[PDB]
Amino acid sequence: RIASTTNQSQPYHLVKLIIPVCEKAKISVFQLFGSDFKELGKILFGNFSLELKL
DNA sequence: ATCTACGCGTAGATATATCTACGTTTAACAGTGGCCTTATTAAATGACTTCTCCATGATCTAC
């Protein structure tokens, strides 16, 4: 939330923020930076067993 | 390799930034009826101290 409230052009701390975030999301860094928004959303919804569909 | 200067990493101190949100029921009522025990009985039996312990003087009798 802080990273999304601060200026978006500001870089994010890799090991401090992104790697733990994708870790808790059960998502590889490759999947996060490579897949499009549709695939990422579908995989996130399946990972947390949500019923959403983007 | 060594002396000297300087730019940087870093730790400490400090000001800042954090979007929704609002409106959160207005109305009218908060039982109207009637009763609030009718009968009957208000004990029937028998017992209501049980006992001593008397006071005083005439008389008998022993020393």
Buried b (16+ CB within 10 A) or exposed e, A17-54: eeeeebeeeebeeeebeeeeeeebeebbeeeeeeeeee
The distance (Å) linking the CA of A20 with the C1' of B10 is 25
Of A53, A51, A33, nearest to A41 by C-alpha is A53
A43 contacts A27 by C-beta, under 8 angstroms: yes
- Please state, in angstroms and rounded to a whole number, the distance separating the CA atoms of residues A14 and A4: 15
Residue whose pair of structure tokens reads 């999947």 in the numeric block: A31
Sign of CA dihedral A40, A42, A54, A13: negative
Amino acid present at A24:
K
The distance (Å) linking the CA of A28 with the C1' of B35 is 85
The radius of gyration computed from the CA coordinates of chain A, to the nearest angstrom, equals 12
What is the DSSP track for A14-36? IIIIIHHHHHHTT--HHHHHHS-
Experimental approach: cryo-EM
- In eight-state DSSP terms, residue A8 is T
Documented resolution in Å: 3.2
Q: Give strand letter and number of the nucleotide nearest A5 (CA to C1').
A: B18
